[PDB]
């Protein structure tokens, strides 16, 4: 479980927000892209796996699951690509709740920046630092550190 | 020291590679940009600080140190912006050595991808996973986890 991530794609202002969630911690990374393509998804996964020890990725849909470019990136980066089918049905709802929360945070900061991408990164910051008392950022580090020992 | 990062800017193929180094671990994040502007640097720091607990950044030059946009981002993200003057003169050399090593890794992967940005992210991956035996990725997590506890 310390190496497990979930991809998630949501839409705002006619653009796409691509999100990777560390399942055990709730920590996220995100980017704005014009549209979800295999190439964009593959590049996003390469960035993620260079930054955190990504063992398994639950892909967000069948097109990315199928994409040869995504498969090439997962091979390159040593990532096991899996489906993201909510076998535990509470998964649909958890992701849905996350997307709603992210968009809410984006709305709270939206006026501080001109570009959506800036507002998205502010929202990533706010989410990962929020005290729930540990934050997601603290949890991911502790989880992986425990795993290393 | 767990919160201390150093910015570094290097050039390749007529483009700019912006690098943030976690001083205590040697862990890096990097991006390709057309040119090093305050706005690009500010955005890069926002991304970094949303992902890792950035307390202090040693800026790479006086223009970024002075930039109002960089100062605004450091304020927003709770980052103490400092100079990057090598008071310990081995700093010039360590950064120089890093840039040389990065470019070498980029050269080793360059043919596998068309875009420089992809090759840079492959090099980030290879650097952060390389066993020196701990890797930089392992060191940064351990350092921050120890700090949390
Ligand atoms: O509300 C949520 C949520 O459920 N998560 C996802 C999540 C998944 C699994 C978890 C989570 C979270 C989380 O609450 O961040 O927390 C404990 C560990 O298990 C979010 C992530 C980003 C943003 Br913005 C909002 C949320
Ligand atoms: O609020 C802004 C902002 O406007 N940007 C920078 C910026 C400066 C000038 C611009 C900008 C932006 C931007 O929103 O990226 O958009 C194009 C118009 O001119 C930020 C970067 C980091 C952080 Br934290 C906050 C912000
Ligand atoms: O050769 C180096 C180097 O010195 N570092 C920077 C660095 C700074 C301080 C350290 C470092 C490193 C490092 O070797 O990564 O290692 C142990 C902790 O103290 C590099 C970072 C990325 C890449 Br690519 C190459 C290098
Ligand atoms: O080697 C490539 C590659 O070509 N890309 C993706 C890619 C696919 C098709 C392209 C690409 C790229 C790319 O280099 O980003 O460049 C534009 C021409 O058509 C990679 C993405 C992740 C990883 Br890991 C490796 C690679």
């Amino acid at each position: 479980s310390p190496g497990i991530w979930q991809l998630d794609c949501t839409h705002l202002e006619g653009k796409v927000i691509l999100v990777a969630v560390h399942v055990a911690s709730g920590y996220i990374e995100a980017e704005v892209i014009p549209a979800e393509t295999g190439q964009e998804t593959a590049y996003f996964l390469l960035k993620l796996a260079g930054r955190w020890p990504v063992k398994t990725v639950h892909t967000d849909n069948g097109s990315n699951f199928t994409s040869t470019t995504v498969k090439a990136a997962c091979w390159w980066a040593g990532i096991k690509q899996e489906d993201g089918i909510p076998y535990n049905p509470q998964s649909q709802g958890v992701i849905e709740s996350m997307n709603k929360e992210l968009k809410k945070i984006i709305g709270q900061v939206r006026d501080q920046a001109e570009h959506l991408k800036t507002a998205v990164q502010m929202a990533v910051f706010i989410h990962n630092h929020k005290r729930k008392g540990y934050s997601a950022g603290e949890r991911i580090v502790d989880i992986i550190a425990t795993d290393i020992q």
Side-chain angles (χ1 to χ4, degrees), chain A residues 14 21 26 31 33 42 45 50 56 70 74-75 77 83 87-88 90-91 93 96 101-102 110 115 131 145:
Chain A
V21 182
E31 70 172 19
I33 52 176
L45 291 174
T56 304
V70 172
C74 288
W75 165 80
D83 68 73
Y87 296 116
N88 187 304
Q90 250 168 226
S91 292
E96 171 171 9
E101 189 53 40
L102 261 177
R110 190 65 188 91
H115 294 135
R131 210 75 68 173

Side-chain angles (χ1 to χ4, degrees), chain A residues 6-121:
Chain A
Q6 169 78 232
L7 281 176
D8 159 53
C9 185
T10 193
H11 296 75
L12 198 67
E13 300 178 17
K15 295 186 181 69
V16 168
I17 303 172
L18 187 54
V19 181
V21 182
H22 184 255
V23 171
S25 68
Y27 172 97
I28 66 165
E29 302 218 8
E31 70 172 19
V32 174
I33 52 176
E36 194 178 34
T37 63
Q39 288 184 32
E40 294 289 353
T41 302
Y43 181 72
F44 180 73
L45 291 174
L46 173 58
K47 288 189 292 173
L48 181 67
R51 289 155 178 72
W52 294 101
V54 178
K55 186 212 193 181
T56 304
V57 165
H58 290 284
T59 53
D60 56 327
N61 61 52
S63 297
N64 278 333
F65 189 58
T66 303
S67 167
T68 54
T69 310
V70 172
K71 287 190 192 299
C74 288
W75 165 80
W76 197 95
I79 296 171
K80 283 186 194 140
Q81 190 202 210
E82 292 180 5
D83 68 73
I85 302 160
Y87 296 116
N88 187 304
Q90 250 168 226
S91 292
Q92 169 83 247
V94 159
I95 290 163
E96 171 171 9
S97 278
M98 175 176 76
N99 289 340
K100 182 173 181 161
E101 189 53 40
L102 261 177
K103 285 173 193 195
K104 190 179 94 160
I105 299 168
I106 289 160
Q108 293 173 359
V109 302
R110 190 65 188 91
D111 78 316
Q112 294 175 50
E114 206 223 283
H115 294 135
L116 177 61
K117 64 189 226 177
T118 301
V120 168
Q121 300 308 322

